[PDB]
Curated annotation (Swiss-Prot):
PANTHER family: TYROSINE--TRNA LIGASE, CYTOPLASMIC, TYROSINE-TRNA LIGASE. It comes from Methanocaldococcus jannaschii (strain ATCC 43067 / DSM 2661 / JAL-1 / JCM 10045 / NBRC 100440). Belongs to the class-I aminoacyl-tRNA synthetase family. TyrS type 3 subfamily. A motif ('KMSKS' region) lies at residues 204-208. This is Tyrosine--tRNA ligase. One of its GO terms (molecular function) is tyrosine-tRNA ligase activity. Residues 228-231, 283-288 are annotated as: Interaction with t-RNA. A motif ('HIGH' region) lies at residues 37-45. InterPro entries: aa-tRNA-synth_I_CS, aa-tRNA-synth_Ic, Rossmann-like_a/b/a_fold, Tyr-tRNA-ligase, Tyr-tRNA-ligase_3, Tyr-tRNA-ligase_arc/euk-type, Tyr-tRNA_synthase. ATP binds at residue 207. Changing residue 107 to T: Confers specificity for the non-natural amino acid O-methyl-tyrosine.
Amino acid sequence: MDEFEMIKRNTSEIISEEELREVLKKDEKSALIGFEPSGKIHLGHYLQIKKMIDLQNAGFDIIILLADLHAYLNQKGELDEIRKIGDYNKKVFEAMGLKAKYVYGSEFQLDKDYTLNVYRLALKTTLKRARRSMELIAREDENPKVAEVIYPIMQVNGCHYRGVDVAVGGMEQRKIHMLARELLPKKVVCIHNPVLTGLDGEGKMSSSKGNFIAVDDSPEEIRAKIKKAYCPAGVVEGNPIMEIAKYFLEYPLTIKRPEKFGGDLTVNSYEELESLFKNKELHPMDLKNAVAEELIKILEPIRKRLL
Ligand SMILES: CC(=O)c1ccc(C[C@H](N)C(=O)O)cc1
């Protein structure tokens, strides 16, 4: 529960833990995350929002960048409409219990000086490298657009927004974060969150891939996605259900299951759950039932708030 450790819990990485220590010591600390507005808000978003809440709980002021022109540059549609999706995403984040100030990229990302710095960065950023930073983010396009390489350098110019101490993102953001680390004068702590695996286990969870559990999915919908979900006995790596168990559920967890095979089993950490599953001592069916029911309970307040 040590702040540093609660912040670190379930992150992939923190560049750098030292700097982070330096930031925790300050009275005023602030942290930033940015999202291309998404028509559906899913566990991937929630993982990251959860982490912002940890930070908020550690006395950080939180900023949410509703990245409308990033979405525009990444071919998500017309600004006007991207904005209204963004405003919907705000509601959801508020429903998740975030206490944040919300900003649309467009509010400041088209300022003369902002673009002038974007063009300054474009001089120091190679095409090869900008392309490389967008592999995990760029909307698939057989004929890649100039917009693709503008996107990252605009992102980089926004990382220092309101002199934030810390920036948060999924691991797919890290090549762009690295560009920023290098190019920008003052360093901010990157905190990176892991990318959840799709329910079919085939890629990583995304809105455009339809392999996700949305935070306002119906319970019937949650049970069915999870029933359908890839979850091979003994395999944890690439198992989205394990992932959910690791990242969302409270412990101790009380996996109810028929006496016929074991009866109710009580586990005290995700690590205990891991070996039980590795052994093939907990069956995917039983795992799924416990996960689905706990998720439904977890997600219920948020679902509820959204009406
Ligand atoms: C700092 C900044 O401008 C920023 C903009 C957009 C994003 C969104 C992120 N690139 C995504 O894939 O959702 C993150 C940070």
